[PDB]
Amino acid sequence: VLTQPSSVSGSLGQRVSITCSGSSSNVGNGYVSWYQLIPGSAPRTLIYGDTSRASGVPDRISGSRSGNTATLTISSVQAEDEADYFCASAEDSSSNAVFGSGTTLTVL
Amino acid sequence: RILTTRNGHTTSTTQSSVGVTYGYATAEDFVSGPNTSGLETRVVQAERFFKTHLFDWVTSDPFGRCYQLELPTDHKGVYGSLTDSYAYMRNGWDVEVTAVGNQFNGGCLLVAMVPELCSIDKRGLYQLTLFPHQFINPRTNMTAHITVPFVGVNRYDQYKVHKPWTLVVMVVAPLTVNTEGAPQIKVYANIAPTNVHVAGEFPSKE
Amino acid sequence: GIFPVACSDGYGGLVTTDPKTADPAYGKVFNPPRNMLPGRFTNFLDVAEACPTFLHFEGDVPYVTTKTDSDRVLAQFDLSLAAKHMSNTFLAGLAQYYTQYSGTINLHFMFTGPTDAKARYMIAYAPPGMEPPKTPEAAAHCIHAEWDTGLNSKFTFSIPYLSAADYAYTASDAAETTNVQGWVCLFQITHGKADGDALVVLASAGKDFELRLPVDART
Amino acid sequence: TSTGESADPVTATVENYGGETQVQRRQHTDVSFILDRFVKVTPKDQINVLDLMQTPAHTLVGALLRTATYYFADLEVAVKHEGNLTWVPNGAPETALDNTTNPTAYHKAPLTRLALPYTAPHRVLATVYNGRALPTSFNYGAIKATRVTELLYRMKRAETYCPRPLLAIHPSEARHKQKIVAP
Amino acid sequence: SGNTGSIINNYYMQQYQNSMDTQLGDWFSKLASSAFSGLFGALLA
Amino acid sequence: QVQLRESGPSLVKPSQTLSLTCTASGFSLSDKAVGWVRQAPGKALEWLGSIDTGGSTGYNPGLKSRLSITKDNSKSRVSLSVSSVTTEDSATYYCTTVYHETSRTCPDGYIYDPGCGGSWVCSRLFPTDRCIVGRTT
- Burial tier of B192 (Cβ tally within 10 Å: 0-12, 13-18, 19+): buried
How far is Cα D55 from Cα F126, in angstroms, rounded to an integer?
60
Contact D140, D51 (CB under 8 A): yes
How far is Cα B160 from Cα E29, in angstroms, rounded to an integer?
34
Residue D125 gets which letter from DSSP? E
CA distances from D20 to C94, D24, E34, F34 (A): 67, 12, 20, 85
Chain C / chain D CB contacts < 8 angstroms:
71
How far is Cα E33 from Cα D62, in angstroms, rounded to an integer?
28
How far is Cα F68 from Cα D25, in angstroms, rounded to an integer?
78
Closest by Cβ to E40, choosing from D1, D118, D157:
D1
Q: How was this structure determined?
A: cryo-EM
Touching check for C19 and chain E: CB below 8 Å? yes
Nearest C-alpha of chain C: how many angstroms from E13? 9
How far is Cα B19 from Cα B3, in angstroms, rounded to an integer?
8
Question: Which are the contacts of C163, defined by CB distance < 8 A and separation ≥ 6?
Answer: B35, B36, B88, C181
Nearest chain C alpha carbon to E22: C166
Number of domains in chain C: 1
Question: Which are the contacts of B116, defined by CB distance < 8 A and separation ≥ 6?
Answer: B164, B166, D69, D126, D128, D129, D130
How far is Cα B160 from Cα B158, in angstroms, rounded to an integer?
6
- Burial tier of B110 (Cβ tally within 10 Å: 0-12, 13-18, 19+): buried
Q: What is the biggest distance separating any 2 CA atoms in chain E, rounded to whole angstroms?
A: 64
How far is Cα F46 from Cα F83, in angstroms, rounded to an integer?
15
Nearest C-alpha of chain F: how many angstroms from A27? 12
Q: Letter for the amino acid at B35?
A: N
CA distances from C9 to C13, D111, D113, D139 (A): 10, 8, 9, 27
Host H or E run for residue B79: helix B78-85
Nearest C-alpha of chain F: how many angstroms from A76? 20
What residues of chain D, 41 to 60, have a C-beta less than 8 Å from chain C?
none
Angle at Cα C58 formed by Cα C54 and Cα C60, nearest 5°?
55
Give the rounded distance of the alpha carbon of B29 from its chain centre. Answer: 20
What residues of chain D, 107 to 146, have a C-beta less than 8 Å from chain B?
122-126, 128-132
Angle at Cα C21 formed by Cα C18 and Cα C23, nearest 5°?
135
F130, F132, F133: best mutation site toward chain B, by most B Cβ within 10 Å?
Answer: F130
State the CB neighbour count (10 A cutoff) for residue F16. Answer: 7
- Could you tell me which of F5, F69, F20, F7 has the C-alpha nearest to residue A42? F5
Paired sense of beta strands B21-22 and B144-147, if any: parallel
Question: Which are the contacts of C93, defined by CB distance < 8 A and separation ≥ 6?
Answer: none
- Could you tell me which of D24, D16, D55, D20 has the C-alpha nearest to residue D37? D55
Contact B57, B185 (CB under 8 A): yes
Chain B / chain E CB contacts < 8 angstroms:
7
Closest by Cβ to F117, choosing from B58, B176, B181:
B58
For residue F78, report the phi and psi dihedrals to the nearest 5 degrees: -145, 135
Domain map (residue ranges) of chain A: 1-108
Radius of gyration of chain D (CA): 21
What residues of chain B, 156 to 175, have a C-beta less than 8 Å from chain C?
156-158, 160
**Helical H segments across chain C, by residue range:** 44-50, 90-95, 136-139
- Residues of B within 8 A of D137 (CB-CB) are none
Bridge partners for C59 per DSSP: none
- Residues of F within 8 A of B107 (CB-CB) are none
Resolution as reported, in Å: 3.7
A25, A44, A48, A92: best mutation site toward chain F, by most F Cβ within 10 Å?
Answer: A44
Contact B17, B1 (CB under 8 A): yes
Question: Quick check: E25 and B24 CB within 8 A?
Answer: no
- Burial tier of D183 (Cβ tally within 10 Å: 0-12, 13-18, 19+): exposed
How far is Cα D83 from Cα D104, in angstroms, rounded to an integer?
10
Question: Which are the contacts of F49, defined by CB distance < 8 A and separation ≥ 6?
Answer: F35, F36, F57, F58, F59, F67, F69, F80
Nearest C-alpha of chain B: how many angstroms from C131? 9
Contact D165, B124 (CB under 8 A): yes
Question: Quick check: B56 and F113 CB within 8 A?
Answer: no
State the CB neighbour count (10 A cutoff) for residue F72. Answer: 12
Question: Quick check: C164 and B35 CB within 8 A?
Answer: yes
| Domain that residue C186 falls in | 1-219
Angle at Cα C41 formed by Cα C38 and Cα C43, nearest 5°?
170
- Residues of C within 8 A of B152 (CB-CB) are 164
| Domain that residue B24 falls in | 1-206
- Could you tell me which of B61, B83, B75 has the C-alpha nearest to residue B169? B61
How far is Cα B99 from Cα B57, in angstroms, rounded to an integer?
9
